[PDB]
C-alpha cells in the first residue's frame, strides 16, 4: 500500500506563461452601421452577447504589465489595419505642384499671423489635355515656401506622395474585443489596489477582454477606464527618470473641444474617378480652434495626483507641474483626432502648478494640420480632408503620461513633465489588468491503482 | 538623490594577482552598473545589471553584492586591466576607483 | 400552500441504531423534499436534496426513501453528531412550507 | 462575518418596519444567479419561510402568509440582502436565517446538485 | 556594427554656444534613445540629458535647464533607413564647462535598462 | 421544484482547489479545450495551431495505456525519490500549479517509463495471444 | 464528433450501449415501431428536445463508472 | 554508471532490417509523423495536408478491431492465395519494401476483410448484450 | 579505485547444473555491474548489463541476482557452450575495475 502508481489525467486545468495571437473582435451593433465606414465594421467576428467571465478561488498569478505580450501585438495590429484602409483610397501624386498663394482675406495684424493661406494652382482636369485653376485654402503647417514673387510647396514634396484618405471612411473609435482561440485562457486581475506588477490574489479567467476604445492620444488619455476608488500611479521602475509613469485617476475630467470655423467641402477632379477635397470659403469669423477644462476640477484632480505621488517620495517633497521641454509637435503639444480631424493642442495653461507639504475654465488653444505622419514612418503621409460646420467633441480626460526630471545635485523638489512619446503607453492603461495563459493538461499524479491486466 | 560612495579609492597591486573593488550606494533595491577607462581613451561596459557581463567581457570579471554593498572582482589581473573604474546608479557616479602596478 | 407533517417531534435511541422520520405531505411534491440538520442554536444545514440524493460532504449513513407525499429519512448507525433537530423541506410550488422538527436524544 | 450572516436591529419597536441586512456574495460566474430568502424559526411554529428574490431581477417571491407587508431588496455592491418587514407585532418574534438558493451542475445540461444552505440567524423580539 | 561620430574638438568663449553632432549608423535609429554624457577633470561623470528620436521627446538634468537643448534629424528615404544625426546645443559657456562629452547608447539585451549605455563616441573637448 | 437555482460551473473553474476538486470538473475542462484579408490567415493560422495542440495530446495519450478516457491507470510504480510525499497531503493540501512546479523535471522521464511500460504490455498481449 | 464521443463511454467504436436508462417521458414508443417503421428523420425531428440532456446524462454515468472503475481498482 | 554512452535511435532507422527488429522501434516512428506573404499559406498547406493524413489513419484503423492501439490482431485468417510464404522466412528474413512489392495487389481485400470481420463482430456484441 | 573480486577462479559442474559466480565489491557500486562471457583466445561478449538485466541476444539463462557490494550470476541448465571465463565488470567511478575470472569446466 506504501508503493503508490503513476496516473495520467487528461484535461488537468493547469496554465503557463505564453506568446501566441489573440484575434479581434468588434460588436456586432457596429456591422449595423454598415458600408466600411471604419476599419474592422466588414473585417471582424461578431462578439458574444454573454462574455462570461468566471472568478476564481484560492488563486495568485503574478503579472508584469511591462514585459508584457500582446500589447506589442495591438500595436502591430492596429498599424496594419490603419495601412490596410488606404490602399483603395486616391494618392495626391498630381498634387505636389506650384502653389500661387496669398494670404487669405483678413483683418491682418503685422504681430500676429494668418494662419491660413489661400493658395490657387495648375491643376490636371479628367481630361489629359486640358488643365484649370482652381484655388484652396491651408495652413502654415502644411506649406513652406521655395525659393519678389511668393510660391509655396507642400511639406511633404521631398519625402513621399500623400495617399489621400477616403472621406467615405471615419476615424472614430469602436470597442475591439481581443479574444484568445481555444486552448488558450485569458486572465484578468480584479484587485483594487493592484499596481500592475507583481502578485495579484484575485483573478478571473475571461473568453474575451472588456471595451478597449483605442485612441490616438499623445498626452492626456482619453475615454480611457476609469479606477476604482483613488487615483494610482503605475511604473516599470520609479526611480527610472527615463521611464514614463502613467496617472490613471477616479473621477473623470470633462474636456470640450472645437473649431468654431465654418468651412466649405469643395470638390476638384484631378482624373477620371479621383475626386481632392478642398477647403471651399471660411463662413464668418475666422476664429483659433481650442479647448475647455473646468478650473476646479482640474485643481482638485491635480492636488488629488499630489495626495498620490507623495507615496512615492515622502511626505516633505514640493511637486510643481510644467509644460514640456521640446521635440516635435505632437509629443510636446497634446494631439487627438476629434471625429476625422486632428487637433494639436497646447496644455501650458494646465501643468503649470506648484503643491508644498504643508465657475471659470481653461481654456487652451490649437493647432490644426490636415498632412499627417502618424507613427513616423519613413514614406507614409496621409492628408485629411475638411469636413463640413462647426466642429465638437465631447471627451473624458482619464489618465496622464508624466516624466520626472533628471534630478541630481541635492534636488529638494520634483517636476513632472508631460509626455507622449511611444503610442503603446496608452495601450498599456488598457490592457494592464489581462495576461493570456496557454492551457496544458494531461497531469500525472500517483494513486494507490494498478492497473488489472 | 542617491550619492555612490567607493571605498578602496587608489590599489596598487601587482599583475597576475586578484582584486575586489567596493562601492555603496545610499538607496538600495536596484541593479548597479561597472565601468572601465584606460588612460586617455574610449570609456567601456564591464558589468551591468550587477552580475552579466558585457560584450567583449572576459569571464574574469565577477560582479556580486545586494543591497547598499556591491562587489567587482577581477582574478589573474593583467597590465591591460590597470585603469580607471566607475560604479552608476542610472543618471548618477562614483568618483572612480583608481588601479595601479605595485 | 401545501402542508408538511414532520413525524416524530422527538426520537430516543441508542448509538448505533437505525431511525427513521417520516414527512409526509397533503398533495403531490413527488421528489421536491429536502432534509436538513440543525443543531440547538446553530443554522440548518443540508442533509439530502431532492429526496433520494446524498449530498456531497454528509456521511452514507443519511439515506432517504419514499416517493410522492411520504417520505422517510433513515440513519443507520446514529451517532453523537447526530443529536440535531431535522426538518423536511418542500419546494415544489410557492410557498416554502417546511418540517415540524426531529430532535434526536 | 461569514457567509450569509444576517445582520441589523434585533429589537423592533411595535408597528414599526424591520429591517435587517444580510451578507451575500456573487457567484463564480456572472452568469451565475442566486435566489436569496429570509426564513423564520419560531418557537411556536416550524420553520417559516418570509420572502426572497432573485439576484437576476428585482421581482420578489415571497409568502403570502404575511400578507404582502414584505419589502425584500438587495445591493449586490453592497453585499446586502434586505428584508424591511413592515408593520411589524409581537408574532414576527422570531430567529431569522437568510438563505442562499441556487444548485452546482457541473457541465451545461444537467441538473448534478442543489446547494440550500443557511447562515446562522438573528433573533429579533418585538415588543 | 554600432557607430557614433562626433564632430572634432573645438574651443570657445566664455558666454557662447557650442553646437556637437552626432552620427549613429548600423542600427534602426528610430527605436533607441541617445543620452549625452560629460567627463570633467576632478569631479567625474555627470549627467545632461536624454532624447528619443522617434519623436524628439527630451529629458534634461536639472541643474542644467535653460542652458542645454537637444534635437534631431531623422533619415527619410527607404535605402538608407539606420543613419540618424543627434545635436546638443549648449549655451551659457562659463571657464568651468571645460571637459569632455560623449553621446551614447544603450545595449540592445533584453535584461538591458536604459542607462547601461553600451556603444559610446569617441569624445569632443570643449575648451572655454 | 419551482424555485430553482444554478451555479453556472464554467470553464477553468478549479485552478485554485485541490486535486480531487479539480478531478471531477476537468471533463469539462477537456471539452471546451478544442471550439474556439491577412486576418482571416492569422485566425486560421491560429485555430489550426489549436488543432496541432489538441492532436499531439491525443496521439501522446494514444501510445500510452489509454485511447481516449480521461483517467488512466498505468504498470509503472511511482518513484519515490521524485517527490516522497504521501497520499493524503497530495490529494487534499496541495494545489495544480504547486503540483505543477514540483516535478517539472522528471516528466520526460515519466513520459519515457508510461512508453515502455505499455509497450512491453504490447509485446506481452501479443505473446499471450500466441498460444491461442 | 470525435471529441463529443469520446468522454462519453465509447473511444472509437461505431456502436455503444451505455448504463442509462432510456427515459419512457421522452417519446414512450416501443421498439418494434421504432425500429422497423420510422425512418431516421423523422427520428430526429421526433426528439429534437431532448437531445442536450441525453448527453448529460451520457457524460454523468461516464464520469460516475470512471470513479467506479478508479475506486475498484483503488483496493487492489 | 559513469562513463555512460548512448545511441541515439532516430526517426526512420529500422529500414533495412527484419520485421522484428522494426516491430520494437515503430512506435517512435508513429510517433514523429505529426508535428513537424504566400509561403505561410504554403506551409499552412503542407500541414494541413499532413493532419489530413494523419486523421484518414486514424478513421481508417479506428473502423478496424482498434481504437488507438499500435499491435492489433483481428479474426479474420491470412488467406494463403495471397503469398504462401511462412512464418520464419517472413518474421526474420524479409525486410518492409520487399513486404511491400510482395502483396501490393490484395491489400484493398485485406481492408474490406477487416471491415467485414470487425462489423459482424459488432452485431455479435450487440446481440451478446440483447439477452442482458 | 575500487577493488573487484570474482569468484571463483574455476567451478566444475555436469550437464544441467545451475551455478553461481560471486562478485563482491569494495565501496557502493549499487548496480553498476557488467557480466561478461570469453571464450579462451576469444572476445569477451556481454551477457548482462546493469547487474539484473538480460541482454537481448543471450539466453535466459544467464541471470543475475544482488545489490550494493555483492552481486551473483547464476547460470540454470548449464550448457556446453558455457565454456567460458566470466567477469564482472565495475562501472560506478573511475577506473574501470573488472573481475578476476571464472572457468567453467
Ligand atoms: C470619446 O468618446 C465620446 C463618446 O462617444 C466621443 O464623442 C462622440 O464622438 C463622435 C465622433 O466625433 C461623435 O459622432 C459625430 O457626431 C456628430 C454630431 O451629431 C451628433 O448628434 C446628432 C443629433 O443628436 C446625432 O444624430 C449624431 O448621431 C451624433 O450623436 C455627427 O454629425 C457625426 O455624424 C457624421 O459622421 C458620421 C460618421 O459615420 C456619419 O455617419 C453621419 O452621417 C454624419 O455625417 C458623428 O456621428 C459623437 O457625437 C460624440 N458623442 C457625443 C456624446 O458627443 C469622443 O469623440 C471620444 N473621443 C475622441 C477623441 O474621439
Ligand atoms: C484690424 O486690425 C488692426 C491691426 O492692424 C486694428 O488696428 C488697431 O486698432 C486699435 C484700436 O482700434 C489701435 O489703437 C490701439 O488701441 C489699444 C487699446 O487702447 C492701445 O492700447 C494701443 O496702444 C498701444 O499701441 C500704440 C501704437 O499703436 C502705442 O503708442 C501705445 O503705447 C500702446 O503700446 C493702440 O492705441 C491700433 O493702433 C491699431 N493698430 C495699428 C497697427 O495701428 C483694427 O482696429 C482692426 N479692425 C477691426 C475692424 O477689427
Ligand atoms: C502655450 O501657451 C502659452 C501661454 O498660455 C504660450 O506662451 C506665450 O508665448 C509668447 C510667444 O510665444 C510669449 O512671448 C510674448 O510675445 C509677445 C509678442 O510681441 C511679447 O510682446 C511679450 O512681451 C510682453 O510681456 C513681457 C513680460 O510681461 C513684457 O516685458 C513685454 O514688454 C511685453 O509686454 C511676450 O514676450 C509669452 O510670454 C508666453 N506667455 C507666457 C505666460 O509665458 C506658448 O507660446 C504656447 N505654446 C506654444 C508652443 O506656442
Ligand atoms: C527597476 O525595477 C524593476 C522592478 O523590480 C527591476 O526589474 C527586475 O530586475 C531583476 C534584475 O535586476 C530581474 O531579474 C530577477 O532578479 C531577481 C533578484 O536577483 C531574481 O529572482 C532573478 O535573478 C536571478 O538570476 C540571475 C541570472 O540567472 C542571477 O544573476 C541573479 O543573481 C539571480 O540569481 C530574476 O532574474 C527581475 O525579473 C525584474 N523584475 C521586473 C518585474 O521587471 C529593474 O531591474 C529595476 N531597474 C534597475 C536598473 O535595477
Ligand atoms: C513652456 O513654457 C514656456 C514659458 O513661456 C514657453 O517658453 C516660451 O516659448 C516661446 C516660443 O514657443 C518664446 O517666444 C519667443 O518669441 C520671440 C518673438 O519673436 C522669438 O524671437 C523667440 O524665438 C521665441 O519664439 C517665449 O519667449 C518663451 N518664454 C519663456 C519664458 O521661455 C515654452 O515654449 C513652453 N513649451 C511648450 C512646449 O509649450
Ligand atoms: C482665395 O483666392 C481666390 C482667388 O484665386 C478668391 O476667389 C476670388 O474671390 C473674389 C472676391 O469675391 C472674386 O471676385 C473672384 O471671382 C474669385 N475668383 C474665383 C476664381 O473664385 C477667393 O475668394 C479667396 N478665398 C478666400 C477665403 O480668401
Ligand atoms: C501677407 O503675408 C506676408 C508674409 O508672407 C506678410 O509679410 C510680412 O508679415 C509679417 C507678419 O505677418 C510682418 O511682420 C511683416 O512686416 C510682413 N512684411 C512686410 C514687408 O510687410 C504681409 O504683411 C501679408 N500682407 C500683405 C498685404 O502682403
Ligand atoms: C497656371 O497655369 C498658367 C499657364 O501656364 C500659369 O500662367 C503662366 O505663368 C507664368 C509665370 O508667371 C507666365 O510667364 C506665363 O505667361 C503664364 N501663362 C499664362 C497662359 O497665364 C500660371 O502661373 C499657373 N498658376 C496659376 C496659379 O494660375
Ligand atoms: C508594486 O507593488 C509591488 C508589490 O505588490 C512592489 O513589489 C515589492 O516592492 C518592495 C519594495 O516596496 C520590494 O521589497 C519587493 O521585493 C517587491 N516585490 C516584487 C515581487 O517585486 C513594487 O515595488 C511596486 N511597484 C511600484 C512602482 O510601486
Ligand atoms: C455653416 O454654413 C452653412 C452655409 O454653407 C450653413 O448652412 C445654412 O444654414 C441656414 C440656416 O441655418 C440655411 O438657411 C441655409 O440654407 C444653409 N445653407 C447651406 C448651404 O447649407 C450652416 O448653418 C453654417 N453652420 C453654422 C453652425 O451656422
Ligand atoms: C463642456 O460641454 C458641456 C456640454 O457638452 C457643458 O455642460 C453644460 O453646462 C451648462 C452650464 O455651463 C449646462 O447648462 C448644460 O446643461 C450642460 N450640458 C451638458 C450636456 O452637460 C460643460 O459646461 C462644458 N464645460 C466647460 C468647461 O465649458
Ligand atoms: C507620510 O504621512 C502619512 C500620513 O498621512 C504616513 O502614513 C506616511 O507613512 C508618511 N510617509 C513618510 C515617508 O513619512
Ligand atoms: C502659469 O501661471 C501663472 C499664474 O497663474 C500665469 O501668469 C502664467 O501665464 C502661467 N503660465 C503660462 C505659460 O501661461
Ligand atoms: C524636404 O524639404 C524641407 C524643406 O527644405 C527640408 O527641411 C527637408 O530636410 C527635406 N527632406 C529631405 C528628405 O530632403
Given at each position: 500500500a506504501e508503493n503508490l502508481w503513476v496516473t495520467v489525467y487528461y484535461g488537468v486545468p493547469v496554465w503557463k506563461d505564453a506568446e501566441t495571437t489573440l484575434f479581434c473582435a468588434s460588436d456586432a451593433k457596429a456591422y449595423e452601421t454598415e458600408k466600411h465606414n471604419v476599419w474592422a465594421t466588414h473585417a471582424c467576428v461578431p462578439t458574444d452577447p454573454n462574455p462570461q467571465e468566471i472568478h476564481l478561488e484560492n488563486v495568485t498569478e503574478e503579472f508584469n504589465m511591462w514585459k508584457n505580450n500582446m500589447v506589442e501585438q495591438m500595436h502591430t495590429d492596429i498599424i496594419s489595419l490603419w495601412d490596410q484602409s488606404l490602399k483603395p483610397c486616391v494618392k495626391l501624386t498630381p498634387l505636389?505642384?506650384?502653389?500661387?498663394?496669398?494670404?487669405?482675406?483678413?483683418?491682418?495684424?503685422?504681430?500676429?499671423?494668418?494662419?491660413?493661406?489661400?493658395?490657387?494652382?495648375?491643376?490636371?482636369?479628367?481630361?489629359?489635355?486640358?488643365?484649370?485653376?482652381?484655388?484652396?485654402?491651408?495652413?502654415?503647417?502644411?506649406?513652406?515656401?521655395?525659393?519678389?514673387?511668393?510660391?509655396?510647396?507642400?511639406?511633404?514634396?521631398?519625402?513621399?506622395?500623400?495617399?489621400?484618405?477616403?472621406?467615405?471612411?471615419?476615424?472614430?473609435?469602436?470597442?475591439?474585443?481581443?479574444?484568445?482561440?481555444?486552448?488558450?485562457?485569458?486572465?484578468?486581475?480584479?484587485?483594487?489596489?493592484?499596481?500592475?506588477?507583481?502578485?495579484?490574489?484575485?483573478?478571473?479567467?475571461?473568453?474575451?477582454?472588456?471595451?478597449?476604445?483605442?485612441?490616438?492620444?499623445?498626452?492626456?488619455?482619453?475615454?480611457?477606464?476609469?479606477?476604482?476608488?483613488?487615483?494610482?500611479?503605475?511604473?516599470?521602475?520609479?526611480?527610472?527618470?527615463?521611464?514614463?509613469?502613467?496617472?490613471?485617476?477616479?473621477?473623470?475630467?470633462?474636456?470640450?473641444?472645437?473649431?468654431?470655423?465654418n468651412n466649405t467641402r469643395k470638390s476638384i477632379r484631378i482624373g477620371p474617378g479621383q475626386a481632392f477635397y478642398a477647403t471651399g470659403d471660411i463662413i464668418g469669423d475666422i476664429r483659433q480652434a481650442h479647448c475647455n477644462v473646468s478650473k476646479a476640477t482640474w485643481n482638485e484632480t491635480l492636488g488629488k495626483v499630489v495626495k498620490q505621488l507623495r507615496k512615492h517620495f515622502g511626505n516633505n517633497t514640493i511637486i510643481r507641474f510644467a509644460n514640456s521641454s521640446g521635440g516635435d509637435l505632437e509629443v510636446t503639444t497634446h494631439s487627438f483626432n476629434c471625429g476625422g480631424e486632428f487637433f494639436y493642442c497646447n496644455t501650458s495653461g494646465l501643468f503649470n502648478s506648484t503643491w508644498i507639504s504643508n465657475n471659470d475654465s481653461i481654456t487652451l488653444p490649437c493647432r490644426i494640420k490636415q498632412i499627417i505622419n502618424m507613427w513616423q514612418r519613413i514614406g507614409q503621409c496621409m492628408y485629411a480632408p475638411p469636413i463640413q460646420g462647426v466642429i465638437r467633441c465631447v471627451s473624458n480626460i482619464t489618465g496622464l503620461i508624466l516624466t520626472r526630471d533628471g534630478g541630481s545635485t541635492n534636488s529638494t523638489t520634483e517636476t513632472f513633465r508631460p509626455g507622449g512619446g511611444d503610442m503603446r503607453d496608452n495601450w498599456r492603461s488598457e490592457l494592464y489588468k489581462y495576461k493570456v495563459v496557454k492551457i496544458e493538461p494531461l497531469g500525472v499524479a500517483p494513486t494507490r491503482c494498478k492497473r488489472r491486466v | 538623490e542617491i550619492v555612490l560612495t567607493q571605498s578602496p579609492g587608489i590599489l596598487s597591486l601587482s599583475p597576475g594577482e586578484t582584486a575586489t573593488l567596493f562601492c555603496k550606494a545610499s538607496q538600495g533595491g536596484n541593479a548597479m552598473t561597472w565601468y572601465q577607462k584606460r588612460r586617455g581613451q574610449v570609456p567601456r561596459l564591464l558589468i551591468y545589471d550587477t552580475s552579466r557581463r558585457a560584450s567583449g567581457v572576459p569571464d574574469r570579471f565577477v560582479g556580486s553584492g545586494s543591497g547598499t554593498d556591491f562587489f567587482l572582482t577581477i582574478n589573474k589581473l593583467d597590465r591591460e586591466d590597470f585603469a580607471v573604474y566607475y560604479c552608476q546608479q542610472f543618471e548618477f557616479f562614483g568618483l572612480g576607483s583608481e588601479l595601479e602596478v605595485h | 400552500d401545501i402542508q408538511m407533517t414532520q413525524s416524530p417531534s422527538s426520537l430516543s435511541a441508542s448509538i448505533g441504531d437505525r431511525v427513521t422520520v417520516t414527512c409526509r405531505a397533503s398533495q403531490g411534491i413527488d421528489k421536491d423534499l429536502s432534509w436538513f440538520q440543525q443543531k440547538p442554536g446553530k443554522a440548518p444545514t443540508l442533509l439530502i436534496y431532492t429526496a433520494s440524493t446524498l449530498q456531497t460532504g454528509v456521511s452514507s449513513r443519511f439515506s432517504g426513501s419514499g416517493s410522492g407525499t411520504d417520505f422517510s429519512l433513515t440513519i443507520n448507525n446514529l451517532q453523537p453528531e447526530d443529536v440535531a433537530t431535522y426538518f423536511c423541506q418542500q419546494d415544489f410550488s410557492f410557498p416554502l412550507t417546511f418540517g415540524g422538527g426531529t430532535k434526536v436524544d | 462575518q461569514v457567509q450569509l450572516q444576517v445582520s441589523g436591529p434585533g429589537v423592533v419597536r411595535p408597528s414599526e418596519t424591520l429591517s435587517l441586512t444580510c451578507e451575500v456574495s456573487s457567484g463564480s460566474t456572472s452568469r451565475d444567479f442566486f435566489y436569496w430568502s429570509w426564513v423564520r424559526q419560531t418557537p411556536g411554529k416550524g420553520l417559516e419561510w418570509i420572502g426572497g428574490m432573485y439576484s437576476n431581477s428585482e421581482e420578489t417571491n415571497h409568502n403570502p402568509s404575511l400578507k404582502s407587508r414584505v419589502i425584500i431588496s438587495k445591493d449586490t455592491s453592497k453585499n446586502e440582502f434586505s428584508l424591511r418587514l413592515t408593520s411589524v407585532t409581537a408574532a414576527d418574534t422570531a430567529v431569522y436565517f437568510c438563505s442562499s438558493r441556487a444548485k452546482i451542475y457541473y457541465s451545461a445540461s444537467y441538473s448534478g446538485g442543489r446547494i440550500d444552505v443557511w447562515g446562522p440567524g438573528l433573533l429579533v423580539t418585538v415588543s | 556594427q554600432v557607430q557614433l561620430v562626433q564632430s572634432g574638438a573645438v574651443i570657445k568663449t566664455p558666454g557662447s554656444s557650442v553646437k556637437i553632432s552626432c552620427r549613429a549608423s548600423g542600427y534602426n535609429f528610430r527605436d533607441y534613445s541617445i543620452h549625452w554624457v560629460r567627463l570633467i577633470p576632478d569631479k567625474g561623470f555627470e549627467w545632461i540629458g536624454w532624447i528619443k528620436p522617434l519623436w524628439g521627446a527630451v529629458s534634461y538634468a536639472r541643474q542644467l535647464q535653460g542652458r542645454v537643448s537637444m534635437t534631431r534629424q531623422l533619415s527619410q528615404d527607404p535605402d538608407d533607413p539606420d543613419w540618424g544625426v543627434a545635436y546638443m546645443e549648449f549655451s551659457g559657456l562659463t571657464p568651468a564647462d571645460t571637459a569632455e562629452y560623449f553621446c551614447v547608447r544603450r545595449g540592445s539585451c533584453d535584461y538591458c535598462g536604459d542607462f547601461p549605455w553600451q556603444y559610446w563616441g569617441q569624445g569632443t573637448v570643449v575648451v572655454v | 421544484a419551482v424555485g430553482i437555482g444554478a451555479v453556472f460551473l464554467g470553464f477553468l473553474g478549479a485552478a485554485g482547489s485541490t486535486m480531487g476538486a479539480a478531478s471531477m470538473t476537468l471533463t469539462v475542462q477537456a471539452r471546451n479545450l478544442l471550439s474556439g484579408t491577412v486576418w482571416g490567415i492569422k485566425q486560421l493560422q491560429a485555430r489550426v495551431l489549436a488543432v496541432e495542440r489538441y492532436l499531439r495530446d491525443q496521439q501522446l495519450l494514444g501510445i500510452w495505456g489509454c485511447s481516449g478516457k480521461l483517467i488512466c491507470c498505468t504498470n509503472v510504480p511511482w518513484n519515490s525519490s521524485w517527490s516522497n510525499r504521501n497520499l493524503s497531503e497530495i490529494w487534499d493540501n496541495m494545489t495544480w500549479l504547486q503540483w505543477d512546479k514540483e516535478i517539472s523535471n522528471y516528466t520526460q522521464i515519466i513520459y519515457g517509463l508510461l512508453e515502455e511500460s505499455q509497450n512491453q504490455q504490447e509485446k506481452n498481449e501479443q505473446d499471450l495471444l500466441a498460444l491461442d
Open positions: 505636389c505642384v506650384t502653389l500661387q498663394c496669398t494670404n487669405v482675406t483678413n483683418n491682418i495684424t503685422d504681430d500676429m499671423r494668418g494662419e491660413l493661406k489661400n493658395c490657387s494652382f495648375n491643376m490636371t482636369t479628367e481630361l489629359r489635355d486640358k488643365k484649370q485653376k482652381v484655388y484652396s485654402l491651408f495652413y502654415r503647417l502644411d506649406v513652406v515656401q521655395i525659393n519678389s514673387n511668393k510660391e509655396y510647396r507642400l511639406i511633404n514634396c521631398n519625402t513621399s506622395a500623400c495617399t489621400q484618405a477616403c472621406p467615405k471612411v471615419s476615424f472614430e473609435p469602436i470597442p475591439i474585443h481581443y479574444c484568445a482561440p481555444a486552448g488558450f485562457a485569458i486572465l484578468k486581475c480584479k484587485d483594487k489596489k493592484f499596481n500592475g506588477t507583481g502578485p495579484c490574489p484575485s483573478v478571473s479567467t475571461v473568453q474575451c477582454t472588456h471595451g478597449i476604445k483605442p485612441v490616438v492620444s499623445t498626452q492626456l488619455l482619453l475615454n480611457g477606464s476609469l479606477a476604482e476608488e483613488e487615483v494610482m500611479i503605475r511604473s516599470e521602475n520609479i526611480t527610472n527618470n527615463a521611464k514614463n509613469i502613467l496617472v490613471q485617476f477616479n473621477t473623470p475630467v470633462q474636456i470640450n473641444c472645437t473649431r468654431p470655423n | - | - | - | - | -
